[PDB]
Every structure is written in structure tokens, then in C-alpha cells.
Design an enzyme around this catalytic site. Structure first.
Site, PDB file in Angstrom:
ATOM      1  N   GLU A 267       9.036  16.817  -6.786  1.00 54.11           N
ATOM      2  CA  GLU A 267       8.507  18.368  -6.491  1.00 54.11           C
ATOM      3  C   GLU A 267      10.060  18.972  -6.558  1.00 54.11           C
ATOM      4  O   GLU A 267      10.712  18.495  -5.963  1.00 54.11           O
ATOM      5  CB  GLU A 267       7.990  18.355  -5.212  1.00 54.11           C
ATOM      6  CG  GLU A 267       7.384  19.424  -4.893  1.00 54.11           C
ATOM      7  CD  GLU A 267       6.123  19.991  -5.555  1.00 54.11           C
ATOM      8  OE1 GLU A 267       5.786  19.393  -6.423  1.00 54.11           O
ATOM      9  OE2 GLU A 267       6.061  21.266  -5.618  1.00 54.11           O
ATOM     10  N   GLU A 297      10.655  28.043 -11.006  1.00 54.62           N
ATOM     11  CA  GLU A 297      11.200  26.483 -10.883  1.00 54.62           C
ATOM     12  C   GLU A 297      11.293  26.123 -12.693  1.00 54.62           C
ATOM     13  O   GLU A 297      12.310  25.594 -13.071  1.00 54.62           O
ATOM     14  CB  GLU A 297      10.700  25.705 -10.056  1.00 54.62           C
ATOM     15  CG  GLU A 297      10.991  26.081  -8.682  1.00 54.62           C
ATOM     16  CD  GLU A 297      10.380  25.512  -7.526  1.00 54.62           C
ATOM     17  OE1 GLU A 297       9.312  24.785  -7.678  1.00 54.62           O
ATOM     18  OE2 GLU A 297      10.785  25.605  -6.381  1.00 54.62           O
ATOM     19  N   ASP A 437       4.260  22.308  -1.479  1.00 58.15           N
ATOM     20  CA  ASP A 437       4.055  20.835  -1.287  1.00 58.15           C
ATOM     21  C   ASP A 437       2.328  20.434  -1.199  1.00 58.15           C
ATOM     22  O   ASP A 437       2.121  19.109  -1.515  1.00 58.15           O
ATOM     23  CB  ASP A 437       4.722  20.389   0.007  1.00 58.15           C
ATOM     24  CG  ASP A 437       6.139  20.964  -0.342  1.00 58.15           C
ATOM     25  OD1 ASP A 437       6.830  21.117  -1.062  1.00 58.15           O
ATOM     26  OD2 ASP A 437       6.753  20.607   1.029  1.00 58.15           O
TER      27      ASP A 437
HETATM   28  O1  LIG Z   1       8.185  23.054   0.918  1.00 57.50           O
HETATM   29  C1  LIG Z   1       8.689  23.345   2.164  1.00 57.50           C
HETATM   30  C2  LIG Z   1       9.887  22.430   2.630  1.00 57.50           C
HETATM   31  O2  LIG Z   1      10.595  22.669   1.536  1.00 57.50           O
HETATM   32  C3  LIG Z   1      12.062  22.956   1.522  1.00 57.50           C
HETATM   33  O3  LIG Z   1      12.870  22.407   0.315  1.00 57.50           O
HETATM   34  C4  LIG Z   1      12.664  23.150   3.010  1.00 57.50           C
HETATM   35  O4  LIG Z   1      14.072  22.500   2.879  1.00 57.50           O
HETATM   36  C5  LIG Z   1      12.002  22.848   4.110  1.00 57.50           C
HETATM   37  O5  LIG Z   1      12.438  23.419   5.224  1.00 57.50           O
HETATM   38  C6  LIG Z   1      10.518  23.200   3.870  1.00 57.50           C
HETATM   39  O6  LIG Z   1       9.694  22.540   5.018  1.00 57.50           O
HETATM   40 MG   LIG Z   2       7.855  24.315  -3.685  1.00 57.97          MG
END
Ligand SMILES: OC[C@H]1O[C@H](O)[C@H](O)[C@@H](O)[C@@H]1O
Ligand SMILES: [Mg+2]
Ligand SMILES: Nc1ncnc2c1c(I)cn2[C@@H]1O[C@H](CO)[C@@H](O)[C@H]1O
Length: 456
Positions: A267, A297, A437
Site C-alpha cells: 500500500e 500515487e 486502507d
Molecule cells: O491510511 C491512514 C494512515 O496512513 C498514514 O500513512 C499515516 O501515517 C497514519 O497516520 C494513518 O493512520
Molecule cells: Mg492511501
């Protein structure tokens, strides 16, 4: 239908590393921002924005980059220097909530909530406060070495007297407005600006004790979701460098695959230092099977690979055709890569080779699942129970959907399989941090699940 999604992933087992932290979240209102800019000469803010600081060394650096994020409507993550004065200025800010942050933390919690068979999370610091932000699930596990033996222990009980890492998340919504140097600035998108801590002592690594057992950890799981490379520094005061951690991390991937060829996923994230960003491409992207990126990205990756015109076109116009072209370049460049995943506020996309074992319809099912997770999280702020997923399922596909889908679908041909799921867009999302995420890890775990189901 939710049942069916949940059944499909239940037997899948996941390893995730390396980053967990606390995310201290501020929900910005007009007046919060107005107050931040009014602490400074508005002219000094404009001049600092012209400089575009890539590290926050004083509060003015922060304010400049936050205004830039609001004004352009684009997420960013920018590191801070570790000094006291700066840290304290940030503590005077009143945060609305604390929650699990970091890819490996968010993904762990999500997959525990979704009740998959096993999750093994590794991160180097695990204080009690940090551990207690993990979901309570008996099969969410942390690897320890006790008397020379590997123990997988319920993460919430595995804590020790470690330091705590805190990142600061500034969330804003479409419609937020304020005045800077006479100009009224209005947010056109809901997103977030991240102030990233990189504590000197916290290394993006598996420590030697556990690292000996990585092969056995790999055998215990079906796939790995990897991130956190974004916090690697070029140099540490003890003389370690980015290269040391990147060589080690590349080797981690081979160790994980040593006794079982599990699927691995990178990721991406907003990486302020272009040398680190390059290393993620050279050392990590080249060794994984799956990659998750937003539009910026993938543009950034393409630029690192020398595709300057295509990358700039992506940044400029966001044409789905150009994103697809970029994905194909990655697939052609990186033989180990099986799936390129790109997520924007309008869609999530998979690009695969025709030889992929999954059909286009099976790829679609992955993305449709993932979109339900993401829209649920956008509505509620958090996915706390499987039952919450009914929220996401109520939200219809955004109005550009049939259109985006139609365009992308025409790039299915003898060489590539393309699937696109339009987002189920919520106008006033509770929060945005971790939506990527959530979508990436959902889509990837579903992908791994369907591959393994087919293999039998
Ligand atoms: O995806 C969200 C996350 O990604 C990031 O890279 C941050 O460092 C973190 O603070 C956050 O929770
Ligand atoms: Mg992201
Ligand atoms: N306001 C919103 N409402 C509903 N879904 C949202 C958003 C936003 I901001 C983002 N997303 C979903 O999260 C994924 C990652 O950007 C996107 O791909 C998308 O599925």
C-alpha cells in the site's frame, strides 16, 4: 449478500506490518482554520506556501501545507522534526478523537472486525495504550519470542513498556471556508492532512528476535498487507540509513515467501521525500503481487519510472484511460505483479493480465465488496460490526459510475482484464483517514480469497 461476502473471506489469514500509531483527529471547522492562519502574517503564509516545505520544522510550515491541502482539495502527509517546542505547539490543539492509525493497525482492526480466521500484526512499539486500540478478537495476534520460541499472542495482551507514536490528522469537509490575505478559500473536497511523526528510535523493520521466524509466520498465513515505508528516513543519528531498512524489508518479503508462496500487497502513501519514494518503487513494488495507490500515487510511481508526460496528464485531468495505461505499464514492467489497484473518490479499479486465474466478474466482486466497506466507513467514521455494512449497501453508486465503468470495460481485451466499481459516495463523510486502507485491504483479501477458492 453481506453474508456471502463474509463467508468468502472467512478462511483467509493475513499478516500485516509495519506501522501502527495513534491517530489524533481534529474535525476542522471554518473558525479553527481562520484561527490558525490569523496567528501569522498572511503574507508569511503565502511566501511559505511558495517554498513548499516538505518537512514541518515550525508551525508556519504546517499552516502553509494545510492551506495548500484545503485549497487544492488533495490529501497530504508531511513529516515533523522531533523538537519539543514544535511538539508542544501541536499539543495545544484540541483533538476530537483518538483512534488506531497506520496501515497495519487499521487493516488489522478491520479484518478482526470482519472475523477472518487469523490476523498476525507486527509493529515494533506496542505500549499498553496502543495495544488497547486494537479490536478485541482472539485471532488477532502479535508475534513474541519467549525462551527462544515463537509465541503468537492476542495483541491486546502483548504490550510492553514501549514508547507511543502519535500522528495528527486534520479532517476537513467540502464547503469549509476561511479567508487568507483577502481571498476566501473554499474546500471543494472532503479529505485530510496528516502530520507524520517519525520518532528517531522507531525503525521500519522486523526486529532480529522475531525476524528469525518470518518464514514460519508466512506459512501460518495466506497473504501479507505491507506498508509504513513512508516513515523511513534517509539517515538516522546512529548511522543507519534508508538503504539498510529497504534492503532488509525486501529480504522480509522473500523470508515471508520462503516456505509458502503467499500473496503480498504494497500500500502506497503520500511520501514527502522523493528519495524514499523511489526506494519504495525499487525495493518493494518490484517484489509484491499487489499494489494499492490513489491517483496521485500512481502518477508519482510513473514519474519515478520515467513516464513524465503520462504522469503529469494523470495529475492534470484524471482520465480513467490514462490511469489504465499507467497500470498496464506497471504490469509490463513488474512480472511479479498480478494486480494493479487504483482508488479515487469516484471509483476503485483493478487491472490484471488476461492470464489471471480470476474472471473479470470475480474481479468485480472483489471491488464491489471493497466499495461497501469504504462507503460504510465514510458514513460512520468506523466499521465496528459486520452489521454496519448495511449502511454502505444503502448508498447508491455515484452518478459517474455507469460512465466510468463503460469506459474502463472497453479496455478488457485478449491481454488485460479490467474491473471498475464506482464509489458509493457520501456528501458529508464523517472522516476520510483510512478509507484507502479499508478499500485496498478489502479488495486484496477478497482477491486472495477467490484465488484460493478457485485453486481447489
Ligand atoms: O491510511 C491512514 C494512515 O496512513 C498514514 O500513512 C499515516 O501515517 C497514519 O497516520 C494513518 O493512520
Ligand atoms: Mg492511501
Ligand atoms: N465521501 C466519500 N464517500 C464515500 N466513499 C468515499 C468517500 C471518500 I472522500 C472516499 N471514498 C471511498 O474511499 C476510497 C478511498 O479514497 C474511494 O475509492 C471511495 O470508495
Amino acid at each position: 449478500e453481506i453474508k456471502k461476502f463474509i463467508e468468502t473471506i472467512k478462511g483467509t489469514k493475513l499478516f500485516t506490518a509495519y506501522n501502527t500509531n495513534v491517530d489524533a483527529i481534529k474535525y476542522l471547522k471554518d473558525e479553527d482554520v481562520q484561527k490558525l492562519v490569523d496567528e501569522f502574517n498572511h503574507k508569511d503564509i503565502i511566501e511559505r506556501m511558495e517554498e513548499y516545505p516538505r518537512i514541518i520544522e515550525e508551525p508556519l510550515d504546517f499552516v502553509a501545507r494545510l492551506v495548500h491541502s484545503i485549497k487544492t482539495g488533495k490529501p497530504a502527509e508531511v513529516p515533523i522534526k522531533d523538537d519539543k517546542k514544535l511538539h508542544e505547539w501541536f499539543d495545544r490543539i484540541k483533538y476530537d478523537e483518538e483512534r488506531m492509525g497506520g496501515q497495519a493497525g487499521i487493516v488489522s482492526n478491520l479484518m478482526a472486525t470482519l472475523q477472518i480466521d487469523k490476523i498476525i500484526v507486527y509493529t515494533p512499539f506496542l505500549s499498553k495504550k496502543q495495544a488497547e486500540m486494537f479490536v478485541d478478537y482472539d485471532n488477532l495476534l502479535y508475534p513474541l519470542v519467549e525462551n527462544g520460541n515463537l509465541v503468537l499472542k492476542k495483541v491486546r495482551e502483548a504490550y510492553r513498556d514501549d514508547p507511543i507514536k502519535i500522528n495528527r490528522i486534520f479532517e476537513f469537509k467540502k464547503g469549509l471556508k476561511f479567508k487568507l490575505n483577502g481571498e476566501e478559500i473554499t474546500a471543494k473536497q472532503s479529505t485530510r492532512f496528516i502530520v507524520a511523526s517519525r520518532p528517531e528510535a522507531l525503525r521500519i523493520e522486523i526486529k532480529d528476535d522475531v525476524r528469525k521466524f518470518l518464514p514460519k509466520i508466512g506459512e501460518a498465513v495466506d497473504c501479507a498487507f505491507l506498508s509504513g515505508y513512508q516513515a523511513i528516513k534517509e539517515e538516522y543519528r546512529d548511522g543507519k540509513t534508508a538503504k539498510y531498512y529497504f534492503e532488509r524489508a525486501e529480504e522480509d518479503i522473500k523470508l515471508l515467501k520462503k516456505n509458502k508462496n503467499i500473496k503480498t500487497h504494497l500500500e502506497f502513501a503520500s511520501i514527502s521525500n522523493i528519495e524514499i519514494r523511489k526506494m519504495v518503487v525499487d525495493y518493494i513494488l518490484s517484489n509484491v503481487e499487489s499494489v494499492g495507490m490513489d491517483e496521485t500515487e500512481i502518477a508519482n510511481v510513473l514519474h519515478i519510472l520515467g513516464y513524465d508526460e503520462l504522469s503529469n496528464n494523470i495529475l492534470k485531468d484524471s482520465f480513467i484511460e490514462d490511469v489504465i495505461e499507467g497500470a498496464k505499464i506497471l504490469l509490463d514492467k513488474f512480472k511479479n505483479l498480478e494486480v494493479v489497484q487504483v482508488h479515487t473518490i469516484y471509483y476503485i479499479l483493478f487491472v490484471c493480465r488476461a492470464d489471471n486465474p480470476l474472471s473479470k466478474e470475480e474481479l468485480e466482486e472483489c471491488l464491489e465488496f471493497s466499495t461497501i466497506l469504504a462507503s460504510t466507513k465514510a458514513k460512520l467514521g468506523n466499521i465496528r460490526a459486520i452489521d454496519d455494512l448495511h449502511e454502505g449497501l444503502k448508498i447508491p453508486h455515484n452518478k459517474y459510475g455507469d460512465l466510468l465503468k463503460e469506459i474502463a470495460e472497453k479496455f478488457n481485451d485478449n491481454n488485460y482484464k479490467i474491473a471498475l466499481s464506482p464509489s458509493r459516495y457520501v456528501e458529508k463523510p464523517k472522516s476520510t483517514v483510512g478509507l484507502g486502507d479499508t478499500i485496498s485491504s478489502g479488495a486484496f483479501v477478497y482477491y486472495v480469497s477467490l484465488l484460493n477458492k478457485k485453486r481447489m
